Amino acid sequence: TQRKNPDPYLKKEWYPVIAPAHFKSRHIGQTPVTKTAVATDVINHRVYEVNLGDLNPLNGNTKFYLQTQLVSDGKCLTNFHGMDITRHKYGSLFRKGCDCIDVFMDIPTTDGYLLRVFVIAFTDRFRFQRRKNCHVKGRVIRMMRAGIYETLHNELGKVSIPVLVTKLSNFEVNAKLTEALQKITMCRDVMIRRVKVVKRPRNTMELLSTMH
Amino acid sequence: YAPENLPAKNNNSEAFAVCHIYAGKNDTFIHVTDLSGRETIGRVSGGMKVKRHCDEPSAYAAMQATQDLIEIITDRGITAVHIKIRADGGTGKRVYGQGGSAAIRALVRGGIKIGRIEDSTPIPTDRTRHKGGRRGRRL
Amino acid sequence: PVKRRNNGRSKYNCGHTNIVRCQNCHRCVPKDKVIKRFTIRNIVDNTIADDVLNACVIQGFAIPKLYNKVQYCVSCSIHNHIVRVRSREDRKIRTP
RNA sequence: GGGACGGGUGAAACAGGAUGAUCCCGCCGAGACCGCCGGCCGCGCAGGCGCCUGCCAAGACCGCCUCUGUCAAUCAAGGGCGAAGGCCGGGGGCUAGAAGGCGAUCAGACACCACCGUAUUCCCGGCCGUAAACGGUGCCGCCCCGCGGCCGGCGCGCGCGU
Numbered sequence: 001t002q003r004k005n006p007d008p009y010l011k012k013e014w015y016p017v018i019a020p021a022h023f024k025s026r027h028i029g030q031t032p033v034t035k036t037a038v039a040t041d042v043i044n045h046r047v048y049e050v051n052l053g054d055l056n057p058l059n060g061n062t063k064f065y066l067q068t069q070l071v072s073d074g075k076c077l078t079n080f081h082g083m084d085i086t087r088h089k090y091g092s093l094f095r096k097g098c099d100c101i102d103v104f105m106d107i108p109t110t111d112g113y114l115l116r117v118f119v120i121a122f123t124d125r126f127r128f129q130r131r132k133n134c135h136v137k138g139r140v141i142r143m144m145r146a147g148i149y150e151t152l153h154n155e156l157g158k159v160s161i162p163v164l165v166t167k168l169s170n171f172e173v174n175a176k177l178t179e180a181l182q183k184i185t186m187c188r189d190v191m192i193r194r195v196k197v198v199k200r201p202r203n204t205m206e207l208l209s210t211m212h
Numbered sequence: 213y214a215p216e217n218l219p220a221k222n223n224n225s226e227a228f229a230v231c232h233i234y235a236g237k238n239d240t241f242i243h244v245t246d247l248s249g250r251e252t253i254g255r256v257s258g259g260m261k262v263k264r265h266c267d268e269p270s271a272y273a274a275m276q277a278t279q280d281l282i283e284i285i286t287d288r289g290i291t292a293v294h295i296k297i298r299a300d301g302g303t304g305k306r307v308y309g310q311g312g313s314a315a316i317r318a319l320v321r322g323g324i325k326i327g328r329i330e331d332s333t334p335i336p337t338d339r340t341r342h343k344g345g346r347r348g349r350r351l
Numbered sequence: 352p353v354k355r356r357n358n359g360r361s362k363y364n365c366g367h368t369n370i371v372r373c374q375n376c377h378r379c380v381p382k383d384k385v386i387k388r389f390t391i392r393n394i395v396d397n398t399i400a401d402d403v404l405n406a407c408v409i410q411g412f413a414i415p416k417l418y419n420k421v422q423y424c425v426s427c428s429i430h431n432h433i434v435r436v437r438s439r440e441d442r443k444i445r446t447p
Numbered sequence: 448g449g450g451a452c453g454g455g456u457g458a459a460a461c462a463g464g465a466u467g468a469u470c471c472c473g474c475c476g477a478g479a480c481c482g483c484c485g486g487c488c489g490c491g492c493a494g495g496c497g498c499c500u501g502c503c504a505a506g507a508c509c510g511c512c513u514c515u516g517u518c519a520a521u522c523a524a525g526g527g528c529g530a531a532g533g534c535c536g537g538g539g540g541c542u543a544g545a546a547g548g549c550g551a552u553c554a555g556a557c558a559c560c561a562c563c564g565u566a567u568u569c570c571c572g573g574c575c576g577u578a579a580a581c582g583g584u585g586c587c588g589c590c591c592c593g594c595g596g597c598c599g600g601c602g603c604g605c606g607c608g609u
């Protein structure tokens with residue numbers, strides 16, 4: 001049954017991993033891999049979860065997903081793949097006594113991507129309100145959902161991957177969402193929960209060149 | 213180990229790995245993996261250090277296993293790690309065991325730099341039916 | 352005779368409610384009859400929080416919390432001292 | 448990828464592992480279900496009711512110097528709906544799990560604990576017509592101490608606050 005084998009780490013070597021130019025700190029780290037027996041084809045399409053705070057040393061509760069698409073000059077080149085918040089923040093948002101709206105929409109880019117965007121929101125209590133609960137009537141909720149859809153469509157209807165990445169990094173969409181929703185009523189929190197890529201074109205080389 | 217078999221050294225920054233802690237109620241796992249969860253640098257379990265099945269998830273076994281893992285990974289050239297602590301989850305206890313904190317303190321007192329810490333326990337948006345029946349473990 | 356006016360549950364203006372499972376024994380209980388508590392705790396015990404912060408490389412880091420809602424059945428809450436058997440007059444008290 | 452245990456219990460033992468398990472990661476397939484918000488909130492004749500989008504018909508409440516003019520209440524017979532389990536004929540097959548098997552405990556254990564697992568649990572058409580189907584309080588109508596909380600609608604007052 002039992003048998004001994006040689007130490008595998010006597011035939012490994014490391015590669016560097018780099019991030020798109022939207023961020024200040026572009027060295028994610030290094031990855032091990034086994035020598036050809038091909039490494040340049042085996043370290044491809046690997047996904048890395050990087051915190052936004054480390055990418056731009058308000059940011060510690062958001063992380064990005066980056067995928068390698070090309071190996072060149074002994075380095076791995078990555079682009080956008082996803083976006084998410086941390087679990088503790090999500091758990092902290094919820095509160096007893098208020099209702100929440102959780103919307104999602106599918107948005108197509110100009111580079112051939114189809115994205116699914118999830119938006120969450122919460123209601124708050126007025127400064128001078130007799131009651132202690134923050135529940136609202138149905139028409140207000142419908143108006144909030146309609147406003148969310150309208151703002152999302154108008155702010156991301158015709159966007160590209162670099163512009164979307166910059167907007168996500170600097171929270172502009174959150175800014176318009178909260179600005180618009182506050183015109184309907186009190187809105188404690190309004191952000192984007194996460195972004196998913198559903199389908200992308202098979203060949204993305206000019207896109208990669210532009211990002212890096 | 214030849215230098216090309218190790219991460220490139222740079223005073224600019226130190227190599228970062230990821231440690232996965234499984235703090236179960238019957239065993240504990242300490243798993244070190246690179247930034248992408250595909251390359252395994254060192255793996256140890258609490259059942260490799262005890263002779264009684266009931267002490268596999270105890271803190272002492274976790275500490276010894278963490279010491280062994282420390283030795284291995286330092287030999288392989290790693291200095292800092294992120295933490296991903298988890299429980300059974302999946303319609304289960306959803307509470308950490310008693311070996312997780314022991315492993316964390318062993319890592320801290322073992323001369324390792326710590327990065328981020330997060331929960332990774334699997335939780336459903338909604339679940340299947342669990343075992344026990346509608347009367348539960350009657351005992 | 353009747354022991355409580357609420358019949359041991361908070362059920363008003365309805366006939367049926369969705370069920371939940373006890374987190375200790377996995378018994379099936381009505382949602383309105385189950386004992387619920389919300390807890391907020393640090394991932395790391397406060398004893399080693401200072402040590403972790405000392406070890407941490409990040410600047411301005413904050414220890415994450417854990418948010419869990421625990422639900423227990425009548426039998427398990429009494430066994431684990433989550434609730435207590437009170438006197439006839441104390442049973443009417445609704446304040447913690 | 449990596450290399451020796453893993454599972455489970457009060458403690459153990461049956462099933463899993465060099466045919467590389469447990470663990471990490473990515474993809475694929477199917478079928479259930481609708482969480483934290485979620486409540487001395489609400490809806491419905493009752494049984495019951497919680498993903499996104501769209502369509503369809505309906506209902507109680509309030510407001511009114513709108514219409515008719517007793518057209519009403521309760522009811523054997525009769526008709527309709529009716530949790531879960533169960534049955535007939537077709538689909539589907541993931542969790543759980545009657546029956547059955549097996550490991551423990553015991554004086555015994557064919558039970559409580561552990562593991563595997565058929566019918567069933569899901570959909571369509573149709574039977575059955577029972578529950579601590581409980582507010583253990585039949586339906587319509589009048590008078591009736593005081594204090595207070597919440598939901599829906601309407602009106603008054605001001606220093607305009609939900």
Ligand SMILES: CC[C@H]1CN2CCc3cc(OC)c(OC)cc3[C@@H]2C[C@@H]1C[C@H]1NCCc2cc(OC)c(OC)cc21
Nearest residue numbers: 349350351430456457458459551552553558559560561
């Ligand atoms: C239902 C299985 C029974 C099998 N055993 C007999 C031997 C035994 C000896 C113990 O002393 C250490 C012991 O401590 C927990 C448990 C047992 C179990 C007992 C089981 C009987 C069961 N019903 C009666 C009371 C009881 C109490 C228990 O304590 C929590 C218990 O643990 C699961 C099981 C039981």
Ligand SMILES: [Mg+2]
Nearest residue numbers: 349350351426
């Ligand atoms: Mg008992």
Ligand SMILES: [Mg+2]
Nearest residue numbers: 352353354355
């Ligand atoms: Mg009595």
Ligand SMILES: [Mg+2]
Nearest residue numbers: 365366367368
């Ligand atoms: Mg009932």
Ligand SMILES: [Mg+2]
Nearest residue numbers: 531532533568
């Ligand atoms: Mg049925």
Ligand SMILES: [Mg+2]
Nearest residue numbers: 580581583584
């Ligand atoms: Mg009766």
Ligand SMILES: [Zn+2]
Nearest residue numbers: 373374375376
């Ligand atoms: Zn419990």
